[PDB]
């Protein structure tokens, strides 16, 4: 468990998880507001 946590935070694994989360977030934002070329709210 402790060693699993340690290995699960090593550079490659942490980076892949971070970028998967970022990709999912951006994908969902684009899905809800697609084809957005300007900021119209204000």
């Amino acid at each position: 468990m402790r060693d699993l946590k340690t290995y699960l935070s090593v550079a490659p694994v942490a980076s892949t998880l971070w970028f998967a989360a970022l990709a999912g977030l951006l994908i969902e934002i684009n899905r809800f507001f697609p084809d957005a070329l300007t900021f119209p709210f204000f």
Partner: protein, 743 residues
């Protein structure tokens, strides 16, 4: 002396301690990172087992377990294939009308407007067309519904899990001992008979029961869903009796040696099936039966435990003549104590085998409705060609690694290797001369033709209408092949392939499957170009292997190791003297050779083979036979091949093939990017990184792990990797777009 099962219990206990420590294998790496270079090293030596330790037993155990892991990966890949075919494919629609529907087994979710890639492939389906040729394999196997594909996918997943567990269990619970790995006689006996022979017998048994009756029903016109299930043909035997009467007697012809009675489904026809455009399945079943017999016999050669057999040492040491001293004496000990020797031999053989597979597979198509699927044919040929070339280059890499590391005349002395190392200078000098001579006469003729055409002197050109260079030998050989059936090979009705001759063009669904391929002056020139490129790459690789240990420049090159940047700017400069650098150059030359080979194949097929048949039998070829007259000059290759056929890929924007144009441009980019690494040195980059690091130090944001520039060898490796990726990917996109739009 005897062959038995030897293992050791619990050599390594499964745990997570070493996961937390990056690079446990190397002591200095285990200590920790001082600079960023460390990180790269950690990956560069991940699978270099023979360097982390020196015990043969540990290396062998690691190799066995890694083999299990890779086998698990392959099984997972196959399970993914079968699942995608089962769920995200139009396999049944294609099965109902093969020539009508374009195979596809991949859809893309609609997220950022990428749904344009879900093109109209037919059969009420929208997806990405696949050129892997899986649909033809499934049709040839007798798969008719998606339930069978689902079952195969689940089974492959289970076998992937089993492979993974086997790897874990064999490395951590029961690790075979060294004497077990060194038992090569029994290994060869089992692989020849237990694996190849028995596997071929099993596949022949499947083909007799499932492939033959199912494909016969399919070709008779029965709808796929109305066909009896593959198991019924086993329960009730009259089902088989109807298609082939000889099943009525059942096995008694096989045991009374009345094998002629099995001529119904065990034939020697040859050629192609006029309906499906592939090899007769009754020929393939007989093929696999004969192969099974041959391998089951050949796997009884080497002695294991019962006296009868052959000792490989005896066979090796019994061969030697006046020109080679005591040759073959000592090779058995070399090949059973060094893994790199075996790896190099096997890599060379597998690369050659893959190349031969490509050649034979486009020569006579073995799957139904594969010949007229031009995209599949082109993609399969090109893929196998590239795989074979890479494996052959790896053969040289590992031969050089063995030469540097495991070669030792004090303890393991071989006579043939000694003589080769003693006249390497003559070998390489003559090979260099051959390379120069071939280069001048193959490419020089192209330059001559180009210059004559530019000067308005077509009568002086080396063409079919000016000065002919007819390959008389190849023409004679293929003529002898055309006349073969009924003369020299009486039992065959049709020639081995339709490329030999004899006319008998074969077409399917209005498309040309195959017809005789003519050989002329352009074929002569391109074949000599092929010979030139192969010889030059062989020169590079052989020179790297032979001069790996020492030369007249650096007499102690072995002490530096297999991989190292140089030996300083002394003696005029010793850049790229190591064997690894020779492999690095051989990669470029292999890329050149394979690119020319695939270009020749594509243009020749389009010009003289592929095309559309019409009612009167007038064949209109994709390219109107311009290869014979345009391929003899470089300007023709640049204009009538690259420029003309790039239109399909460059226009792909706005359609389902837009991804191919995107990959075309991206591959161009990555290839040009590689030149950044291939042309520069690390000193400039380190000096620039110094200023960057200072800029970071000014803001208290400098990394603790000091950022060093890439090592020299790493710079070369990155350059070659990017070069190969970019070139191969741009050719991939070009071929796929061209043949999908025009095919």
């Amino acid at each position: 002396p005897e062959v038995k099962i030897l293992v050791d219990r619990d050599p390594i206990k499964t745990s997570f301690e070493q996961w937390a420590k990056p690079g446990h294998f190397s002591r200095t790496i285990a200590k920790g990172p001082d600079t960023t270079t460390w990180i790269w090293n950690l990956h560069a030596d991940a699978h270099d087992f023979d360097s982390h330790t020196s015990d043969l037993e540990e290396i062998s155990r690691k190799v066995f377990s890694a083999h299990f892991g890779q086998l698990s990966i392959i099984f997972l890949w196959l399970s993914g294939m079968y699942f995608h075919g089962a769920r995200f494919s139009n396999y049944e629609a294609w099965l109902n009308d093969p020539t009508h529907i374009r195979p596809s087994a991949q859809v893309v979710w609609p997220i950022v407007g990428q749904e344009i890639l879900n093109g109209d492939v037919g059969g009420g389906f929208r997806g990405i067309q696949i050129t892997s040729g899986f649909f033809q394999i499934w049709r040839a196997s007798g798969i008719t519904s998606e339930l069978q594909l689902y079952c195969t996918a689940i089974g492959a997943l289970v076998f992937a899990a089993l492979m993974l567990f086997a790897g874990w269990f064999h490395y951590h619970k029961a690790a075979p001992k060294l004497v077990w790995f060194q038992d090569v006689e029994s290994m060869l006996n089992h692989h020849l008979a237990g694996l190849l022979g028995l596997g071929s017998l099993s596949w022949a048994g499947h083909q007799v029961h499932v492939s033959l009756p199912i494909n016969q029903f399919l070709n008779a016109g029965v709808d796929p869903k109305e066909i009896p299930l593959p198991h019924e043909f086993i329960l009730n035997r009259d089902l088989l009796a109807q298609l082939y009467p000889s099943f009525a007697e059942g096995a008694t012809p096989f045991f009374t040696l009345n094998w002629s009675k099995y001529a119904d489904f065990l034939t020697f026809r040859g050629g192609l099936d006029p309906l499906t455009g592939g090899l007769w399945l009754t020929d393939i079943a007989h093929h696999h039966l004969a192969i099974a017999i041959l391998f089951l016999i050949a796997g009884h050669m080497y002695r294991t435990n019962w006296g009868i057999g052959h000792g490989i040492k005896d066979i090796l040491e019994a061969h030697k003549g006046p020109f080679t001293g005591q040759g073959h004496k000592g090779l058995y000990e070399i090949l059973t104590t060094s893994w790199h020797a075996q790896l190099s031999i096997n890599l060379a053989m597998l690369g050659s085998l893959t190349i031969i597979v490509a050649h034979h597979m486009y020569a006579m198509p073995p799957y139904p409705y594969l010949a007229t699927d031009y995209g599949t044919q082109l993609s399969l040929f090109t893929h196998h060609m590239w795989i074979g070339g890479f494996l052959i280059v790896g053969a040289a890499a590992h031969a050089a690694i063995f030469m540097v590391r495991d070669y030792d005349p004090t303890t393991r002395y071989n006579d043939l290797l000694d003589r080769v190392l003693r006249h390497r200078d003559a070998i390489i000098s003559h090979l260099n001369w051959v390379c120069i001579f071939l280069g001048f006469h193959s490419f020089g003729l192209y330059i001559h033709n180009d210059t004559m055409s530019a000067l308005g002197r077509p009568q002086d050109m080396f063409s079919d209408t000016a000065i002919q260079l007819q390959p008389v030998f190849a023409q004679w050989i293929q003529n002898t092949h055309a006349l073969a059936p009924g003369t020299t090979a009486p039992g065959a009705t049709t020639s081995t392939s339709l490329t030999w001759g004899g006319g008998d063009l074969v077409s399917v669904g209005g498309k040309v499957a195959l017809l005789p391929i003519p050989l002329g002056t352009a074929d002569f020139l391109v074949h000599h170009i092929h010979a030139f490129t192969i010889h030059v790459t062989v020169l590079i690789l052989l020179k790297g292997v032979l001069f790996a240990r020492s030369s007249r420049l650096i007499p102690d090159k072995a002490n530096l190791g297999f991989r190292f940047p140089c030996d300083g700017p002394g003696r005029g400069g010793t850049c790229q003297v190591s064997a690894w650098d020779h492999v690095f150059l051989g990669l470029f030359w292999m890329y050149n050779a394979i690119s020319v080979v695939i270009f020749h194949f594509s243009w020749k097929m389009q010009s003289d083979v592929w095309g559309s048949i019409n009612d009167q039998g007038v064949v209109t070829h994709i390219t109107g036979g311009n290869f014979a007259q345009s391929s003899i000059t470089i300007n023709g290759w640049l204009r009538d091949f690259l420029w003309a056929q790039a239109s399909q890929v460059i226009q792909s924007y706005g359609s389902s093939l837009s991804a191919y144009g995107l990959f075309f441009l991206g591959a161009h980019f990555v290839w040009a990017f590689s030149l950044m690494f291939l042309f520069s040195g690390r000193g400039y980059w380190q000096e620039l990184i110094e200023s960057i690091v200072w800029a970071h130090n000014k803001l208290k944001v400098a990394p603790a792990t000091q950022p060093r520039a890439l090592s020299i060898v790493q710079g070369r490796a990155v350059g070659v990797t990017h070069y190969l990726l970019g070139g191969i990917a741009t050719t991939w996109a070009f071929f796929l777009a061209r043949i999908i739009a025009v095919g």
